[PDB]
Amino acid sequence: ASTQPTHSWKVGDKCMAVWSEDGQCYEAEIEEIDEENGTAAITFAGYGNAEVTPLLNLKPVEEG
Ligand SMILES: CN(C)C(=N)NCCC[C@H](N)C(=O)O
């Protein structure tokens, strides 16, 4: 138990994640979820970078 999910995420979903390097949000796809830690491994689309970031950092892709 680490991050208590406030959002329900599934593998292969598009989300926006906060890049650990800039702290800004970027579009990323969930590759793997760890519900215990409340984290998901996401891959930033276009760049190809991937990081394990808590579901709390994952935001829905709101196009506006
Ligand atoms: C959200 N992510 C991963 C990024 N915004 N990445 C930018 C740095 C990596 C890029 N290939 C580059 O070297 O420019």
Curated annotation (Swiss-Prot):
Associates with spliceosomes. Associates with U4/U5/U6 tri-snRNP and with U2 snRNP. Interacts (via Tudor domain) with SNRPD3 (via C-terminus); the interaction is direct. It comes from the Eukaryota. The Tudor domain mediates association with dimethylarginines, which are common in snRNP proteins. Detected at intermediate levels in skeletal muscle, and at low levels in heart and pancreas. The gene is SMNDC1. This is Survival of motor neuron-related-splicing factor 30. Signal peptide: none annotated. Coiled coil: none annotated. Residues 8-64 form the Tudor domain. The chain holds residues 65 to 128 of 238 of the full protein. Involved in spliceosome assembly. Belongs to the SMN family. It is found in: Nucleus speckle; Nucleus, Cajal body. The lineage of its organism: Eukaryota, Metazoa, Chordata, Craniata, Vertebrata.
